[PDB]
Amino acid sequence: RPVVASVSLNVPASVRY
Amino acid sequence: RPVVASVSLNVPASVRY
Amino acid sequence: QDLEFTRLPNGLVIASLENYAPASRIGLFIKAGSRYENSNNLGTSHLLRLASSLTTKGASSFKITRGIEAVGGKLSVTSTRENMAYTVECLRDDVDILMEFLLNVTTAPEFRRWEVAALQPQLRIDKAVALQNPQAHVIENLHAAAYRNALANSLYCPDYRIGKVTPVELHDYVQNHFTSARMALIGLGVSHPVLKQVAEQFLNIRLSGAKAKYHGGEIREQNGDSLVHAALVAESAAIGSAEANAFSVLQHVLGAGPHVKRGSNATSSLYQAVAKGVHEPFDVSAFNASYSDSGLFGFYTISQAASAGDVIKAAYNQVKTIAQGNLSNPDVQAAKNKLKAGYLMSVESSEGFLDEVGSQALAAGSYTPPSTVLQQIDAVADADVINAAKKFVSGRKSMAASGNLGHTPFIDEL
Amino acid sequence: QDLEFTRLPNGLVIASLENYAPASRIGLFIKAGSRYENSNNLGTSHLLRLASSLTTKGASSFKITRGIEAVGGKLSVTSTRENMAYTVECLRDDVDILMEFLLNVTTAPEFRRWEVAALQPQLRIDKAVALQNPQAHVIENLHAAAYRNALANSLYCPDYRIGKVTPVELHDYVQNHFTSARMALIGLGVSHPVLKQVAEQFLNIRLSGAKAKYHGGEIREQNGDSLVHAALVAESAAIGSAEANAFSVLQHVLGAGPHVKRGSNATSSLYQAVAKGVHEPFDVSAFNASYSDSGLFGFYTISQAASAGDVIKAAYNQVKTIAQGNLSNPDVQAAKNKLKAGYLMSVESSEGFLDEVGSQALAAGSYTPPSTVLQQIDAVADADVINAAKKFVSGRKSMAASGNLGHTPFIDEL
């Protein structure tokens, strides 16, 4: 699936798909 | 080049080519 | 309430939708993904994805991290091979603060020398958490194998690059890609003139990228895992083209992902086709990726070692049958009900909603409401759904896989 | 003195050449290279290449390492994708000891559990010293890209495999590949009946491998180095075939490596062809690899980043001219004088001599003296030398490269 990155200052870093 | 391995008990391990 | 949507002389989109919600929200979608990274500056966006919370001119790395937490907001950075979002959240009583924090990130980053040095080895963790989830180096090699120049640049950063990034190698990037001609100061839970104020006062400022030249190629990863993963794709088409909406429905025709928790996925043509003969664990689904210049389509594999070929040769044969006319209409109209749902359900949440309001604004220049899409799903043709798969089968193939690869075939053995 | 050469009922070759030299020497060439490693047991030969000096039945890992050093010998292990030599040396007054040490390695290895555990992390060093010399992961990926099943198995061991090798995963290997049907108890500086004694008393004991199915493929390594390395090859032929001896001369026609220290390599058709237009550092030469089942032929690159295409497109165009008939006879007869030399010069030393006495004995079954080879170099045809390059150009292509790859082209752009 068209994976997308995400980090933050307060949201847990994750891997959308 | 047709590389070859070589280790030993007393010769320094090397890479022929 | 309805959706304003405007545009400045600088090319800077805006939006706003004062839903009278308590929770304000902002997004600033930007085209600065990994594709605009040339050969020298690889992995820079990965670093820049963490470069939030760093020093600015208007405030320090410290003041930001405390002012935000006081009001109770966030500062998240979604990013893709195309885009680079700087999303936030807050309570609407305190937007005027958090806006000031934001544009000081983008409009005035100092990117000092030393704060970088602490920030680099963070990558070895960030890059590592992802690859606990083995998809995201399977999927990267596709873009590495299939495409060549721009979209092949992984989001994440190669190892050796770490320890070596330069700050000038950001200033050059920011001054070339955070540009008011290709941005989108989206908003939400907030009024329109407010944003029109700030953008004209801070964002009133001034490179390009090459095209994804498809190649067709295969990469292999014998990495000792107990399972197999594999993806097999072919040239898709970009978004906006109605050729897209034939794939995106052909997705659900073929493999959608589980709609029922712990379900047998009966209606999936592909997963059902594997279930005969196979009597061991597996899972499999469609892969649709639709970027502005181009895209990919195919499917993604999960199987044991010996049973890679015996699964992939169900998918490939199945989709040929979908290309040889063997198909029904209710499958499609059933499949559309899925596609017509996931779009709406995705934009259920303000965030998933916010992901779509602006993602259009950059490639396109207008917001398509949901209704106008559902027409474009209704106006789809069962001669496009077919082809579609004819493009897939006849088309050149790119492939990648990971795990044990002692019984996994190449393309040509298909 | 002349070269005895025999054969037992078990299929165990022997040799001996009592040159009345002071320094005795022995080799035991065996077919157990990486090719006979299946998907599960990868990197096992790498471990087994270090497994010398370990415990046996006839003696310990300790007694071996001290008895050898007392008399002053050695215990070296040359190994290839085909072969696995257990060479030694000594003074001829003390052969009867060192022989006993040897066959206890091969005929009675215990491969205890714990000595392995100390021995595994040695690989992370061994694997690391080599890749200070960047060729040996460029060259490995060729066999990884080009060939599929057997010869693609690198000599060296993948990372993740370390920490996980099993001893049973050696006993199964040894009992399947250190077999008296495919061995060669070569000797030198030593008499013939002596070896005939020992082999019948210890080696009087009892799998196969798949063939190298060429594919054609390309692998890429963007690894931040300051230079570029690249190799571009096509299907060669195996040894023994006179088609081989057309390549091996076509090697020196095209690029040989420097015969003059610090020389401009004038007579090399390829290196000279680069020297026009290019005015920066580079180096380039032919790549000939001739295994029993198959082989490869091509050339190997060294250049800067921007000037990869501008160098490779000299080689490829040049060799086309060698395939389009444009060629002279003295180049060949000059090139033969090189090939006729390197063979003899290689077997100058007893060791390099010993490398050839038995390498024939395993694939072939007879020792070809030097003279009989030099005839086979004289009987070569200038319609084989041509195709030869016609096979290269028209043939399917495999490729790999390492360094910076922002201006390095694929196959298809050639």
UniProtKB/Swiss-Prot annotation, chains C, D:
Oligomer status and interactors: Component of the ubiquinol-cytochrome c oxidoreductase (cytochrome b-c1 complex, complex III, CIII), a multisubunit enzyme composed of 11 subunits. The complex is composed of 3 respiratory subunits cytochrome b, cytochrome c1 and Rieske protein UQCRFS1, 2 core protein subunits UQCRC1/QCR1 and UQCRC2/QCR2, and 6 low-molecular weight protein subunits UQCRH/QCR6, UQCRB/QCR7, UQCRQ/QCR8, UQCR10/QCR9, UQCR11/QCR10 and subunit 9, the cleavage product of Rieske protein UQCRFS1.
Listed Gene3D superfamilies: Metalloenzyme, LuxS/M16 peptidase-like
Paired cysteines (S-S): none
Major location category of this protein: mitochondrion
Name of this protein: Cytochrome b-c1 complex subunit 2, mitochondrial
Signal sequence extent: none
Keywords of the record: Acetylation, Electron transport, Membrane, Mitochondrion, Mitochondrion inner membrane, Respiratory chain, Transit peptide, Transport
Alphabetized PROSITE patterns for the sequence: INSULINASE
Assigned protein family: Belongs to the peptidase M16 family. UQCRC2/QCR2 subfamily.
Alphabetical list of PANTHER family matching this protein: CYTOCHROME B-C1 COMPLEX SUBUNIT 2, MITOCHONDRIAL, METALLOPROTEASE
Subcellular location: Mitochondrion inner membrane
Membrane topology, from the record: Peripheral membrane protein
Residues that bear N6-acetyllysine: 31, 164, 211
Gene designation per UniProt: UQCRC2
GO MF annotation: an example: metalloendopeptidase activity
Alphabetical GO biological process terms: proteolysis
Cellular component, GO, one term: mitochondrial inner membrane
Protein role: Component of the ubiquinol-cytochrome c oxidoreductase, a multisubunit transmembrane complex that is part of the mitochondrial electron transport chain which drives oxidative phosphorylation.
Pfam families: Peptidase_M16 (PF00675), Peptidase_M16_C (PF05193)
